[PDB]
């Protein structure tokens, strides 16, 4: 994979795994690859436990970053909702992994070929589960 040249700027973090960014001068909604943070918006699931916590975590991490970078995987770059599918980095730390390492997201929606960081993220999930962190508490 390679990060896209430069970085994006934050417009609005919507919840733990979805953020709107100004990416190449276009406002874009991005959904984080290979993770799921708990739901806070859609009424069918309601506000899931650790949903508020995952949102605050993502928001702080992207708001305090000097540099936000976007890395696409090898397959499709947008999902069926028109959301960009990427690994997002806040000063070179992957948000997707940070969330999983905190037990604030589960590794989910693994669709080949978009699975380059799947084993890295599953190792972080394993560590959060053996530490009983948050979702795994
Ligand atoms: C992360 C990811 C989600 N999605 C879809 C799967 C789910 O579709 P359905 O809504 O039809 O269940 C939804 C999960 O996103 P949310 O967690 O934002 O709801 O987004 C993809 O299509 N590809 C991806 O790589
Ligand atoms: Ca989610």
UniProtKB/Swiss-Prot annotation:
It is found in: Secreted. Residues 117-137 are annotated as: Disordered. Residues 117-133 have a biased composition (Basic and acidic residues). Ca(2+) binds at residues 17, 36-37. The active site is at residues 31, 39, 83. This is Nuclease A.
